[PDB]
Design a protein around this ligand. Structure first.
Ligand SMILES: NC(=O)c1ccc[n+]([C@@H]2O[C@H](COP(=O)([O-])OP(=O)(O)OC[C@H]3O[C@@H](n4cnc5c(N)ncnc54)[C@H](O)[C@@H]3O)[C@@H](O)[C@H]2O)c1
Ligand SMILES: NC(=O)c1ccc[n+]([C@@H]2O[C@H](COP(=O)([O-])OP(=O)(O)OC[C@H]3O[C@@H](n4cnc5c(N)ncnc54)[C@H](O)[C@@H]3O)[C@@H](O)[C@H]2O)c1
Ligand SMILES: NC(=O)c1ccc[n+]([C@@H]2O[C@H](COP(=O)([O-])OP(=O)(O)OC[C@H]3O[C@@H](n4cnc5c(N)ncnc54)[C@H](O)[C@@H]3O)[C@@H](O)[C@H]2O)c1
Ligand SMILES: NC(=O)c1ccc[n+]([C@@H]2O[C@H](COP(=O)([O-])OP(=O)(O)OC[C@H]3O[C@@H](n4cnc5c(N)ncnc54)[C@H](O)[C@@H]3O)[C@@H](O)[C@H]2O)c1
Ligand SMILES: N[C@](O)(CCC(=O)O)C(=O)O
Ligand SMILES: N[C@](O)(CCC(=O)O)C(=O)O
Ligand SMILES: N[C@](O)(CCC(=O)O)C(=O)O
Ligand SMILES: N[C@](O)(CCC(=O)O)C(=O)O
Ligand SMILES: [Ca+2]
Ligand SMILES: [Ca+2]
Ligand SMILES: [Ca+2]
Ligand SMILES: [Ca+2]
Ligand code: NA
Lengths: 412, 412, 412, 412
């Protein structure tokens, strides 16, 4: 793959030149507000020590408290967390929620840690960054390798230092102040975004076949919402294998099978498939829901889809963007399509601060309102600048951050 | 009387066994988070010193900031405040408001103190606990022997240490950020709770006679709400005496007489009664609205009511529960029936942190909604466990607190 | 044994009557500033939970930050910690160090917990009281069942909440800011106190035989300091056994045996004896160095010593005091004789605050100066009030605290 | 040449291996406590923006508040700051002052910036890190490109956020709480260290010729102190040129020349010299006083000196260590030889806490005592481990840091 931060900076530079941003402002907007790397050392269950480095990149807070998840994944590194944090700054601005961008992570493999070890690691990480995050400062959330239980531990340990602070972290369990709809939000939002795009062509999800890479929090709920809107999901992969069915996979049955600890390749309602063949599978629509950088100069020519919906963060690098453009492929960008998560996190934060929770229908209605407005704004920018969808979104968010930055000023 | 904490712990033990709680979880849930006892010394108006001991027992905060009133009464002691604080943990969970449980108090008799002395004592108590309470930590309120003027002093003294903090205490005067409906909330909620129970029997308040022990914040508004629904209030007592009328007392006239500094025994619309005969008075419904432990093994066999509505905290001890069960008496438990006060306190707190107030119709509609949902949940819980109303409520709240506790976890 | 707080309060009342304190002042001085009880729950090494109640009693801060140790012992309870905290208030005032009194503890048996469990318990206790202690607020230290390693964990955990705070706790390891001389300070000060007393009779430590109950931090260093000054230590006990030698035990050899995990009853340089006979052993001087209340009305009549030096806190109850007085026994009281520990803790705190350390010769020279001045002040007070040594010291401390209290005043 | 952090980590691994440190302890000690990178953007005098990245690497605080300077230099980058911060941890431990290690910097070139721009940049950097530093947390100081005026601005800006905090930074101007002797301290300590080393051969500074690379705060005061001890300084260089005199340079005259804005090349008391030939000059003693890594695999074979005194931080990489060892060259390591600056910074910090300032002789005599004891400790370590001087110092410091770390423990 191309370096994640090289890739994201190329997109940033391209969006800057479209806006004609002042080069000094551009440099400021590139540099993160604050990068934090902390030692995270815990005792394992047997008493022996293990040490990790935890990252929290606080990229920009011009538009509000910083926002973005925490990734537990062995390939977490500073370039990846910096790219993801920068993308959070643009994404929060695309959907126009009052947040800036941050991201955190620990280079561990959760499969290799017991649940008590994962809890200790999460608490120690929180101890090491508690003074640098906060309800109006920087509010984490899940990402790959973390979930609502992880967020419970963050809330619990943070609150020892600062009092009960439900709004310090989102994606919480419902019974600890979480929001109805947040578990499903990213996948649902991907489908709202996809519906909005397809309507421009006079088409619907039910007209299309879909291939999905990754089957975790994003991939499961995306697949479910696609299936319920009549889409034909013809292939699904995850880290362990994959399953295909040209007639469409019964996603309801597939999810039930997964919840029983079944593996994709063993699902009886399709054919086991090599997961290394997922991205080049025949389909109308490809939805990467796992790692970034997976569409690159080596495989972009072999993509068969006419639409790519970026549910994962930065699945497509700029070399692939160019190849896929010349192939006639249309790419709905991450900073729009996957923003349902952070948008419903904003609603969770609002409910916590207000001391009163919303029903799930109100959460999703507001989510759809935000995704609809953002798409209309992206459309208008694409027309103004005669640019592609990625740049329509990137320039929309970049300009909103630039405006707030310029209003705040530069004197000491 | 039975020791209050022995009594309340016996009920906790019984509810824990119905739920099959793990014994180590049970032990943690019994132990208070933090017990605080502080010297409170003031100059009296003549300059001489008096020293009191103030309490704030913080029992459990798994479900949110702790909540519970402050009692000024001569029998305030550690066991009583611990029992009350534990009941707040279950009560907040029964009505499903995002609070844990706490309680405070001072062993004094307010009638013996001037209004300037009460103010000094209140401000000194606040000075001694300010660092332990807070909007998102522990939020007091009135109880026996305190009122909205007490809360105004707490607010005012607390705000010297932390800035304007209206949400630090509830039961405030309207002109200092209090909620419409809060003064009447506990007594009105008692009547909503009672109507909900009686509907299960195809009966209304207007079918019944009522005897009420105590005639302060809870007893007055309960009596008023009963009277306005056609209930016959045939006996009322307070510390100083009692009055009866088997035809029903004109509660509007009784309240006017009280407001004029009249004594119950002197009311011309009834007959003076020995207050010691109140609990055993001939009535359909007995509502204790004063001290706890007043129904016990020595008088329970003499109760004539078929319903007991626990407006007071813990008026019936476990020995009396058994005796009254064998008499066919139905007891609507404190942790449900009197939760209207803490419920509207939640609404007050919400109005304060949100910086915007509600009208009284909204307050009371939501109070009714919360009291109805809780009763319906208690009923279902009774069916699930084939248990009495007390255990239906106690297990409902205990289970919710256990669920939050287990999510939060145990590592340091 | 008499209740520890009943015993200590009887002494307080006796001293108050000697001074003629105003009854309202007296009542205020008795009541603790703040009593704290906190849940302390940890996972054991096998993951199962254990729950303890931790105590910090903050008795009085009129003269400065509160000071006193943390006891891990199965008989720790509120009465014991209240008595100990009150004694620290008088003791700090007897030696005229600028501290008030406090004490903490957990009712546990350290021998039944692994070293990792003891660390987690210590860290959780610190998390539960961190907001209540502080360099200028309340500074803990060791007591029975805790040591410098315990203090290292308190320092380390506290510093996560408040930054590096070496002066928040004393008795630290040298490599974490501890003071030279602090490990030996209580036993050495016992010897300085004893030498001051014996000079009044024209006697030396080398003239006397000694029996010592307890052989931990206080007993080992006391025995060593006596041995090195030619005193004959004829009996030593601990919780598992006892050893005697009428010619004097070779304490250097006894300590080496202890350091090799030997038991007292097995030491080859004496005869085994029943530890239940230690306090009635023939000797000139009896030094209790373990639990309180061990000299009581059931054994005081059989004591054979002419001098009792109270190294332990409150080893002699007031019934035993009277019996022993009538036997001609002279008792050098705890609040003077064992104050070397807290005095060198003061020096440790000063060194930490000043940022540089003293050598051991300077520590011990200053310790001797403090113990000499205190004894001279005690003698003077005994002459003024024609009272015994205990009351001379107790009234000296109580009067100093009363002075500071009256200067601070009582208005809000 | 070699990467600064690769180099320093090789030395750490070598010292770890000598000590036999467990791999899990070794890994923890390598990882910094906290790495911080912050945007520092200011308006230039003409109003146009410039943006820099500022660093504060907090490597280890086991032994106390972290300590280390701030470098303004165009080659400042994360690897350099990390290496320097790690060296501060070992250095502080070598001289046995109660500090851990940190370092900061900004990748600017001060010659580019006006004095008002340098002030704004320093103040903005302070605004960005004030929450990270503090009297008992992390105390900065000068380094390359900064001076006492830089420290005045840090103090002034920091104090807006936290009140007057003289001890938050050392190297301050004398008129704002600085210490006499601090300006000259690093160079004077270099000479104390050198005198101690040469005494092991029965030789003195006055027996040797010297070449000095760098002529700033370290190089000028090192040159002056060597000159005043009869040393023959035959060559001196800085960034702009160099000067040699085989008969010895009149350093007093050279320092007046420099104070007159003269360049080394113009000095009439010498012959101008290519500065690229400084390190290979014909001398007995080479003293690097500028950048790190200047002695490497490319030029170590060409060094003619028989002694290298490391005044600069990490002037010699491990490839050159091996080459020079083979040529019989003795290298006195940075973590010992240049520790006079941080030692007198410790004295400055103590004076600020004490509230009174020492005379210069007291400072320098105490500095000499610290440098003499450290050298004796190093020699003992070399003998114990049969290792070179660098490892004698590195293991002495590393062991002290390990010991404090192990005392503190690992549970959360
Ligand atoms: N969770 C959110 O709220 C959210 C929001 C927006 C975007 N995202 C992005 O969506 C992506 C997925 O996050 P998630 O929350 O679903 O993570 P998750 O940990 O819940 O699941 C990740 C899934 O990807 C699979 N996967 C991992 N490596 C793979 C590989 N090499 N090939 C195929 N499958 C692989 C895993 O097996 C699993 O099915 C990430 O890029 C994340 O940053 C997440
Ligand atoms: N106020 C609230 O919001 C609230 C909420 C829930 C439950 N409660 C409980 O309701 C009960 C009453 O509290 P309140 O707020 O009305 O107190 P209050 O001080 O306003 O009134 C107390 C009343 O009880 C009477 N009383 C006291 N001792 C009595 C005795 N021995 N016999 C008869 N009457 C006696 C007093 O004379 C007075 O009429 C208490 O158990 C309290 O904990 C109060
Ligand atoms: N450590 C201090 O600085 C300090 C200061 C002043 C006073 N004190 C008091 O000194 C006494 C001893 O404290 P320590 O620090 O030496 O404790 P420690 O835990 O170091 O040692 C306690 C000793 O007492 C023995 N002991 C326990 N129960 C016993 C029993 N039933 N019979 C005989 N011996 C028994 C133990 O076996 C052990 O030898 C306590 O009263 C303590 O409060 C301690
Ligand atoms: N200042 C202190 O207290 C202190 C303490 C210990 C060690 N050090 C180390 O000493 C070294 C010098 O620091 P300083 O305070 O003297 O810095 P400074 O900014 O005062 O002076 C640096 C000097 O080095 C010269 N120089 C720069 N680049 C050069 C090059 N390529 N070749 C030759 N000369 C060059 C400059 O011209 C100037 O003479 C650094 O490694 C620093 O980390 C400084
Ligand atoms: N996974 C996310 O970080 C979610 C962030 C949030 O909910 O705050 C994302 O990539 O958007
Ligand atoms: N009196 C109460 O404590 C009410 C508490 C509140 O309103 O917060 C009660 O007993 O419920
Ligand atoms: N063990 C002590 O509490 C010592 C207290 C201290 O050193 O601060 C005591 O009993 O004096
Ligand atoms: N220049 C230094 O950082 C000294 C810092 C200090 O004086 O604290 C160094 O490299 O030692
Ligand atoms: Ca920026
Ligand atoms: Ca508990
Ligand atoms: Ca008191
Ligand atoms: Ca480390
Ligand atoms: Na274990």
């Amino acid at each position: 793959a191309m370096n994640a931060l090289v890739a994201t900076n190329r997109n940033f530079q391209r969006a800057s030149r479209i806006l004609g941003l002042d080069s000094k402002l551009e440099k400021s907007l590139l540099i993160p507000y604050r990068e934090i790397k902390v030692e995270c050392t815990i005792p394992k269950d047997d008493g022996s020590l293990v040490s990790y480095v935890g990252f929290r990149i606080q990229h920009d807070n011009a538009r509000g408290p910083m926002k973005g998840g925490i990734r537990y994944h062995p390939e977490v590194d500073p370039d990846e967390v910096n790219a993801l944090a920068q993308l959070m700054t643009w994404k929060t601005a695309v959907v126009d929620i009052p947040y800036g961008g941050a991201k955190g992570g620990i280079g561990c493999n959760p499969k290799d840690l017991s649940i008590s070890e994962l809890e200790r690691l999460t608490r120690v990480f929180t101890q090491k960054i508690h003074d640098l995050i906060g309800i109006h400062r920087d509010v984490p959330a899940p990402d790959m390798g973390t979930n609502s239980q992880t967020m419970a531990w963050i809330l619990d340990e943070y609150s020892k230092f600062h009092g009960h602070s439900p709004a310090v972290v989102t994606g919480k369990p419902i019974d600890l102040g979480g929001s109805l709809g947040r578990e499903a939000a990213t996948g649902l939002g991907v489908v709202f975004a996809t519906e909005a795009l397809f309507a421009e062509y006079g088409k619907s999800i039910s007209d299309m076949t879909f291939a999905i890479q990754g089957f975790g929090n994003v991939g499961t709920w995306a697949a479910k919402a696609i299936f319920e809107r009549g889409g034909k999901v013809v292939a699904v992969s995850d880290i362990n294998g994959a399953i295909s069915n040209p007639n469409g996979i019964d996603i309801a049955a597939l999810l039930k099978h997964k919840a029983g600890n079944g593996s994709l390749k063993d699902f009886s309602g399709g054919d086991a498939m090599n997961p290394n063949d997922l991205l080049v599978h025949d389909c109308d629509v490809l939805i990467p829901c796992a790692l970034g950088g997976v569409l690159n100069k080596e495989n972009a020519n072999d993509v068969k889809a006419k639409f790519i919906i970026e549910a994962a963060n930065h699945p497509t690098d700029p070399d692939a963007d160019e190849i896929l453009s010349k192939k006639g492929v249309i790419i709905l960008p991450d900073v729009y399509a996957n923003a349902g998560g952070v948008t419903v996190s904003y609603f969770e934060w609002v409910q916590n601060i207000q001391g009163f929770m919303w029903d799930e229908e109100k959460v999703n209605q507001e989510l759809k309102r935000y995704m609809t407005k953002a798409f209309n704004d992206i459309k208008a920018n694409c027309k103004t600048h005669n640019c592609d969808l990625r740049m329509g979104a990137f320039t929309l968010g970049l300009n909103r951050v630039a405006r707030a930055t310029l209003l705040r000023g530069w004197e000491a």
